[PDB]
Amino acid sequence: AAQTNAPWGLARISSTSPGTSTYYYDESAGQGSCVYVIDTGIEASHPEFEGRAQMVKTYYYSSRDGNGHGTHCAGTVGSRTYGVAKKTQLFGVKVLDDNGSGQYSTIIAGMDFVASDKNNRNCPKGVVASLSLGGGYSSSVNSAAARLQSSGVMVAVAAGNNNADARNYSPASEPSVCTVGASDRYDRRSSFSNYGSVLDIFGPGTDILSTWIGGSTRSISGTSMATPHVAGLAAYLMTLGKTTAASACRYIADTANKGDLSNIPFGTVNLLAYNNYQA
């Protein structure tokens, strides 16, 4: 399938070169997979989600996304126009308040929630979790991400936006999950993207158009934006039977566009997420 005039990041994920504007993907489109978006919530009534999004948990007085960040990330995973996996089922877990903040104890609870909750959902092609959040190093936060992964969920986490080594941030520094840095439309490392040996993969992260609250759209930047490209790609590939939740990060690295990015520090992978779809 071909989506013309797609957001650059979607075009980039299905291309061997930057600078194109059509997204090519297998029409199965992540059908039968599930992606949990662990964030500020999802405006599930947005027409871009087509009824495929729903809130399953909140730790606050409301399940509403009063911020936008979680809706934007969910849109990059699975919205009809701005998403990688346009037929996946989206599940919102509101661990972040409407200012974008959350205590690590609530983030941990949310991760353990998903590890159990997937057993309440129909995800025959597999389960992914997207975590566009983080803070300072915490062994407890990393351990929670490791348990979620170990339970059979493909865990993708943002590397962080400190232009520094992700070793000092969590869950970015957890080795067993998929740690995602950000690139721009010219295949440069995004100026804010963390780096380091713990990164597994890069995805499009500078000026990413997606859904927003109020039934709207906007373009923002961050490793938060790169992460849902990778979560959506994992779901898409699991639907296609190419990989599993346990191995999808490594499979994405194995099949990535290699050596295409500039300003990658010595010791950081030069690997850009790629769906290797041949139309």
Swiss-Prot record:
GO BP field: proteolysis
Coiled coil: none
Annotated ranges, domain Peptidase S8: 7-279
EC assignment: 3.4.21.64
Keywords: Calcium, Disulfide bond, Hydrolase, Metal-binding, Protease, Serine protease, Signal, Zymogen
Recorded superkingdom: Eukaryota
GO CC annotation: extracellular region
Disulfide feature: 34-123, 178-249
Catalytic activity: Hydrolysis of keratin, and of other proteins with subtilisin-like specificity. Hydrolyzes peptide amides
Active-site residues, as the UniProt record annotates them: 39 (charge relay system), 69 (charge relay system), 224 (charge relay system)
Cofactor dependence: Ca(2+)
Binding residues for Ca(2+) 2: 16, 260
Residues the entry annotates as binding Ca(2+) 1: 175, 177, 200
Major enzyme class: hydrolase
GO MF annotations, alphabetized: metal ion binding; serine-type endopeptidase activity
Cofactor, free-text remark: Binds 2 calcium ions per subunit.
Protein's job: Hydrolyzes keratin at aromatic and hydrophobic residues.
Family: Belongs to the peptidase S8 family.
Protein known as: Proteinase K
UniProt source species: Parengyodontium album
